[PDB]
């Protein structure tokens, strides 16, 4: 199994006086930190969110972030003047790394303007997106003047991130392996006919996210299964909903095979009808 760190930023400038920057981090599927506009420190979300870092290490880091947020803000307002862009603006960053077995790691830092990719960090420098607008080339020019920022971003991605994600993995060890069994049941939705029925197979409360549901005729995979979106629960479990458009009654009698990981093999198969 693999657990990428993902640090997200959301920055929104309505006019040149009203603006907010909110952040958050995910280890794998679990959210581990968050950082809102009004708070001047970074909120931890798991007892083990500080990973393996000392309390003074964790401080000089929060300091780097604190100086970045404020400086990032002025710099955008100032690009707006130079590049002739009109408010409102919407910027997102997504930066992080992924530690691989046998000591290696890869990493990333992509930013997006009004919801489309515009640039990223590669090796030592900023680079434009394949097909980004003309002005983007000027922004890159101005970003690459700042030699100190470049080496800081580089140090953080190539060096600090990997060290932090290693700690988090052995310090949030038992939570990353936790397993939670689901409860499932069947029901009947709105008619898509006449004269045909709608079959719904609910699956609630499982964790981790990776799962597998289909509608079965014994051992026969009945495609035309429409699996919904895997939805979130407040307690960090997930909820699925798999449908089947059918002629009544062929079936009854049919089955829904749930293949989750705990359930170490002895999965749940339900038959039409029991409600």
């Amino acid at each position: 199994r693999l657990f990428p760190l993902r640090c997200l930023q959301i920055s929104s400038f309505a006019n040149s006086s009203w603006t907010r920057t909110d952040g958050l981090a995910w280890l794998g599927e679990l959210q581990t930190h968050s950082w809102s506009n009004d708070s001047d420190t970074v909120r931890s979300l798991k007892p083990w969110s500080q990973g393996t870092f000392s309390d003074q290490q964790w401080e000089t880091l929060q300091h780097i972030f604190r100086v970045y947020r404020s400086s990032f803000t002025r710099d955008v307002k100032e690009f707006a003047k130079m590049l002739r862009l009109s408010y409102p603006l919407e910027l997102q960053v997504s930066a992080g790394c992924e530690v691989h077995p046998g000591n290696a790691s890869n990493n990333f830092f992509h930013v997006a303007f009004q919801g489309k990719d515009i640039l990223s960090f590669q090796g030592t420098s900023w680079e434009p997106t394949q097909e980004a607008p003309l002005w983007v080339n000027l922004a890159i020019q101005v970003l690459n003047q700042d030699k100190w920022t470049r080496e800081t971003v580089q140090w953080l991605l190539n060096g600090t991130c990997p060290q932090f994600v290693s700690g988090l993995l052995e310090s949030g060890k038992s939570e990353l392996k936790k397993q939670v069994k689901p409860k499932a049941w069947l029901s009947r939705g709105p008619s898509p006919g006449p004269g045909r029925l709608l079959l719904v197979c609910h699956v609630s409360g499982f964790y981790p996210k990776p799962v597998w549901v289909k509608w079965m005729r014994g051992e026969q995979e009945q495609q035309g299964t429409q699996p919904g979106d895997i939805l979130p629960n407040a307690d960090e479990t997930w909820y699925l909903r798999a449908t089947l458009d059918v002629v009544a009654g062929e079936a009854a009698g049919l089955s829904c095979r749930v293949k989750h990981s705990s359930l170490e093999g002895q999965d749940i198969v339900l038959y039409w009808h029991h409600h």
Epitope: V67, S71, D75, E78, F79, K81, M82, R84, V142, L143, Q145, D146, K147, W148, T149
Partner: T-cell receptor, first 113, second 113 residues
Framework: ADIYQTPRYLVIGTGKKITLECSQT?????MYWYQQDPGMELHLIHY???????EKGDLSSESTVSRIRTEHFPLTLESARPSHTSQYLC????????????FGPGTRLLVLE | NQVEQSPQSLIILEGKNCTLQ??????????LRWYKQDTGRGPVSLTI?????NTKSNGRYTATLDADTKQSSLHITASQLSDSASYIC?????????????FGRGTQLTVWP
């Protein structure tokens, strides 16, 4: 290739129209206008990132600038005033490893009744 | 004023050495520079340095930065009559054109024969 200002000095009646000329035959994109009352530090009144960008520093001055060619960045006062008396200094800057600023000879403006 | 200089003025005999002082509170600090302004003319940049520097040179002029205590100093060697001028200390808060510059009030140097 340097940076120039005309006129060196200027005496003018109040209420009339002043235009200080500044010219730059280096390649530079960025330029600034400073105002230096005597015995005081350089105060920044306008700057421009390049052609068509003209911004202000400070919330006060009643002067306007325009940038339509890279080489010209002229300062304008619509109706002169005693309060406008000062030295005015024009400058540009480049990169190619750190920034570097190049200043002009400046203009001595005196405004009378 | 986040940039402060000392002494206000001083007088030296020619051929003697001297040292001038600059103190700042600017944050973030990116870089700092010394400007020689002859009387009635425009400032001329002498040296620019960063924390990645600790020392710069340009003829008889040598500047040294201490980023920890937030202080720079300028040393002139074997002074000459042509050295008499106002020396201005200026600090920048970004390492790109995307930053403000802050101007000291400057020290007045007078060199006698």
């Amino acid at each position: 290739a340097d940076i120039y200002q005309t006129p060196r000095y200027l005496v003018i009646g109040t209420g009339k129209k002043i235009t200080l000329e500044c010219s730059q035959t280096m390649g530079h994109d960025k330029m600034y206008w400073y105002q230096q009352d005597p015995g005081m530090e350089l105060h920044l009144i306008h700057y421009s990132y390049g052609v068509n960008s003209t911004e202000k520093g400070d919330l006060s001055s009643e002067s306007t600038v325009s940038r339509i060619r890279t080489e010209h960045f002229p300062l304008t006062l619509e109706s002169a005033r005693p309060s406008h008396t000062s030295q005015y200094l024009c400058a540009s800057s480049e990169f190619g490893t750190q920034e570097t600023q190049y200043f002009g000879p400046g203009t001595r403006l005196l405004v009378l009744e | 004023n986040q940039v402060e200089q000392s002494p206000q003025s001083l007088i030296i005999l020619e051929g003697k050495n001297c040292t001038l002082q600059c103190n700042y509170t600017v944050s973030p600090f990116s870089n700092l520079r010394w400007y020689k302004q002859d009387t009635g003319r425009g400032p001329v940049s002498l040296t620019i340095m960063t924390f990645s520097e600790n020392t710069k040179s340009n003829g008889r002029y040598t500047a040294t930065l201490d980023a920890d205590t937030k202080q720079s100093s300028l040393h002139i060697t074997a002074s000459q009559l042509s050295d008499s001028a106002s020396y201005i200390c200026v600090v920048s808060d970004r390492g790109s054109t995307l930053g403000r510059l802050y101007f000291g009030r400057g020290t007045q140097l007078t060199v006698w024969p």
